[PDB]
Design a protein around this ligand. Sequence first.
Ligand SMILES: O=C(O)[C@H]1O[C@H](O[C@@H]2[C@H](O)[C@@H](O)[C@@H](O[C@@H]3[C@H](O)[C@@H](O)[C@@H](O)O[C@@H]3C(=O)O)O[C@@H]2C(=O)O)[C@H](O)[C@@H](O)[C@H]1O
Ligand SMILES: [Ca+2]
Length: 320
Amino acid sequence: RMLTLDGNPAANWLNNARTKWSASRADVVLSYQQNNGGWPKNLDYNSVGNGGGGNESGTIANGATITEMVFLAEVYKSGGNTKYRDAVRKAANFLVNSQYSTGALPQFYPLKGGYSDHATFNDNGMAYALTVLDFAANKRAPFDTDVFSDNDRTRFKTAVTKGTDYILKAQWKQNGVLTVWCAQHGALDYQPKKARAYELESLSGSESVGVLAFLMTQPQTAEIEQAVRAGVAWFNSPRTYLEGYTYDSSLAATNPIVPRAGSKMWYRFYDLNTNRGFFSDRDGSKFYDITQMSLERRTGYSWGGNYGTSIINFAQKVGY
Ligand SMILES: O=C(O)[C@H]1O[C@H](O[C@@H]2[C@H](O)[C@@H](O)[C@@H](O[C@@H]3[C@H](O)[C@@H](O)[C@@H](O)O[C@@H]3C(=O)O)O[C@@H]2C(=O)O)[C@H](O)[C@@H](O)[C@H]1O
Ligand SMILES: [Ca+2]
């Protein structure tokens, strides 16, 4: 009931994160870890100066925490310096502490109020956090050192199970048909939620890839295979993707959605009920013609992309 990890987009993310920066930057990465064990925000460890730790909320926004901990785990594996092992231990403790009883992972922790409290798939936050904890649970590199004990691994396995349970319950039923996920759901009510003003309740063409990838690392029970099949069917349906089109971000001044032979496009946001791709703006509005959007949002955010390609090709590979 296990699928290969070869080609799994989440596994790929994680193995890349192991070597994301130069090893020489391990100390600057480390210098930003908050006391609670999470990182205060996403950072370019190639341009910034040294941090001074801190006591702010940790976050999984934009790859924060989950990237740093995979990277430091590799550095520890490679170099042996225990301060990096300790950092990784606090990061994983941070992740499990952040988890609600339902299995949901918030974007910021300690909780800050507002949308950050929600179960956050945005930026592959929750799916990739669970992928990290799962690799740690299963002694997979770079977590195949002494960084964790048997009891740690049981702790993480419990976390992954609860997170899996959350994903399965949150998966959206579109007029009776299992589909995908919103970029954020209520931690306690499982309902799709808004985030920032231009991020409305919807199916996420972006984050659902990562969610499916994460499920595909899990043992494929009947209900997990159904969920992955249903999710994959949704990505691969002519009611979901635009045919003969691509998203070209360099053309966002007026319209990034352009005719392109041999190409499919997926919307960033799909209507929960009609599966109509849509657009928003800083006024919280919802509309279907990207040219009506403010210049700043059309160029400042991706309203579509090649999202489905990687999960569809992967599902093919494994016989789904
Ligand atoms: O499509 C994307 O996900 C988008 O991500 C980045 O940009 C988004 C956003 O569009 C930006 O305006 C910027 O947002 C501001 C702050 O940086 C952020 O902390 C948050 O509070 O929202 C602020 C805002 O509303 O403007 O950064 C956002 C982010 O990092 O998620 C990329 O820069 C963008 O090119 C695209 O990939
Ligand atoms: Ca983002």
